[PDB]
Design a protein around this nucleic acid. Structure first.
Ligand code: ZN
Ligand code: ZN
Ligand code: ZN
Ligand code: ZN
Ligand code: ZN
Ligand code: ZN
Lengths: 84, 87
DNA sequence: GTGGCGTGGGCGGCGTGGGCGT
DNA sequence: CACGCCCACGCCGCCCACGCCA
């Protein structure tokens, strides 16, 4: 488990370099990605896409039992648990 | 099933999510993190505090579609709505 | 009766951190 | 490194419901 967070307060360790680098961003407040629509900055590109579905109403994802729709899969995973 | 189970003695209460169990546990720990800054009373929940604040500012966002009467909360409006269907 | 309101439960919205596949 | 799933946690804020109070 080779990549060590080299900030002092943090012993956190990562299996790959892309992991660490992404992690460092939380000590830096760095948010690359910007919303073409709200001007809000976020730390990652995947989150900015899930984010965008908040304006556009994009909503992949369906509850197999009631076919209610959600913006993300975590949302439907969690939703589906309420039928059982 | 409901995976998250309260581990306390006489409470046999379960929850699909763990954020629900984290909220439910405060009823046992009498904790009350949220505070009205006007009367300084404290609440177990941020949403119950937001409607509590209404009793001070008189905000009443919810209007009966039948009669226009305004309520602090929608369930107050709903309970009220029943009286039009009645006698 | 009608309405004020504390307060728990269900559950969707959504930020955002790790793990990891390609 | 890049993109982009899957997953997990935590808080927010709605609806509802009940129940006690004036
Ligand atoms: Zn670190
Ligand atoms: Zn936006
Ligand atoms: Zn469903
Ligand atoms: Zn309990
Ligand atoms: Zn108050
Ligand atoms: Zn009315």
């Amino acid at each position: 488990r080779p990549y060590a967070c080299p900030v002092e307060s943090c012993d956190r360790r990562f299996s790959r370099s892309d992991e660490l680098t992404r992690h460092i961003r939380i000590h830096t407040g760095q948010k690359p990605f910007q919303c073409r629509i709200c001007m809000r900055n976020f730390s990652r590109s995947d989150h900015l896409t899930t984010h965008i579905r908040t304006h556009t109403g994009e909503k992949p994802f369906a509850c197999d039992i009631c076919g209610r729709k959600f913006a993300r899969s975590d949302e439907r995973k969690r939703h589906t648990k309420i039928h059982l």
